[PDB]
Amino acid sequence: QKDAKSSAYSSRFQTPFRRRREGKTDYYQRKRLVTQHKAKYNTPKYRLVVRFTNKDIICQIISSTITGDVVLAAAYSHELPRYGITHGLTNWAAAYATGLLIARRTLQKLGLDETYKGVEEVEGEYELTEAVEDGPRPFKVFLDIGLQRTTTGARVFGALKGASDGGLYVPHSENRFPGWDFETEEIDPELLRSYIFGGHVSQYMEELADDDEERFSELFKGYLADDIDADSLEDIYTSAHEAIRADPAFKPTEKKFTKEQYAAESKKYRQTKLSKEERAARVAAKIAALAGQQ
């Protein structure tokens, strides 16, 4: 387009921070998260990073260093098969699941886990996992939304309620839990609970095979071909929690081929770039090409 950038323009142009270009960091709220009270010194602020890719859920407890942010421990939804969730791995329940996993998984490796049980009961209700006088204090973590909109009933606050239920003091309020009726200035513990066990994938599931045979065959091609009944759903999620509070400890993957291997193939689809003589050569020819006015 004939709005080509003047050379003045390019020269006085001041670039944003790298990740401000990529649109991945809100450096405004980053600063206000990371910054510790100065007379608390080397005390790290710990962040509940909760990101949602298209097919996964990413949870990380992270702090900050000048040489770079440092992660205490990370859990993903894509782990959830291991604890018996193999469908709907980005829905609300997965979030609560993942939030609970990273809950245990951390203060396990902090050894705070025996004390600070969280809930186990989970009848869905607003409460903060707070401390036991004469004993230590709960591990404190601050929710880092990212760039996610703060909408009442948002997947991101699933992970929150998953994690607070896991026993991390992660300070929050209700009005973004599903079941918050603004007219009421209140919260339905019922609905909030439902989601935790996936009641909205359940109710929708039944309505489909009793409304639209084919459309249900596709949305849920998986559950069928796996014989998960519509209402075995809760027991899956319910049984996952067990399984999770059971062995939270991170098992990695088993990966064929070492780093060296993986490496020496993957970006040996690398375009290696020309060398000086070669490039000048490439150009010297380029001239004699166009050289001869036409």
Binding site: Q14, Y27, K31, V34, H37, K38, A39, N42, S64, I66
Partner: protein
């Protein structure tokens, strides 16, 4: 009439550098400051809270206090015929650590760690810095270096 407002004459002093405007990076908030540290005052004109007075710009002092979002710097001002003591309450943006000092400690380590293998070899320490001394004799070689003698040039005009 004359102006002597608090930020007068500071048009270039409290200006942000070329193509280095905007938001302040995070390394600044990640520095830890203890009492007794030596800092450098250098205002940041965008962060207008906790701002130093234009005087203290370019000065250097000791932290007598540490608070929520600011450090208390001591600076010795000269007023009249005699230095006085100024207590600054500045925000973390307007502060660096003094390299010159944050080295010194490393010489202290190293100077007192020459002392390590010093006694543990029984020999002489010899620590105090001694300044550049006159050269010692040399013997420059003529080999591949037959002095290439030069001479003044004529005058000439190129307009």
């Amino acid at each position: 009439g004359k102006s002597h407002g608090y930020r007068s004459r500071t048009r270039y002093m409290f200006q942000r550098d070329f193509r280095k405007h905007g938001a302040v990076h995070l390394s600044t908030y990640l520095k830890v400051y203890k009492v007794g540290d030596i800092v450098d005052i250098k205002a940041n004109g965008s962060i207008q809270k906790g701002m130093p007075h234009k005087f203290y710009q370019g000065k250097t002092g000791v932290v007598y206090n540490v608070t929520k979002s600011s450090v208390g710097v001591i600076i010795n001002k000269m007023v009249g015929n005699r230095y006085l003591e100024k207590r600054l309450n500045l925000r973390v943006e307007h502060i660096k650590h003094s390299k010159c000092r944050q080295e010194f400690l490393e010489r202290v380590k190293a100077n007192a760690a020459k002392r390590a293998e010093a006694k543990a070899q029984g020999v002489a320490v010899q620590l105090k810095r001694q300044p550049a001394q006159p050269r010692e004799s040399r013997i420059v070689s003529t080999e591949g270096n037959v002095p290439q003698t030069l001479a003044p040039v004529p005058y000439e005009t190129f307009i």
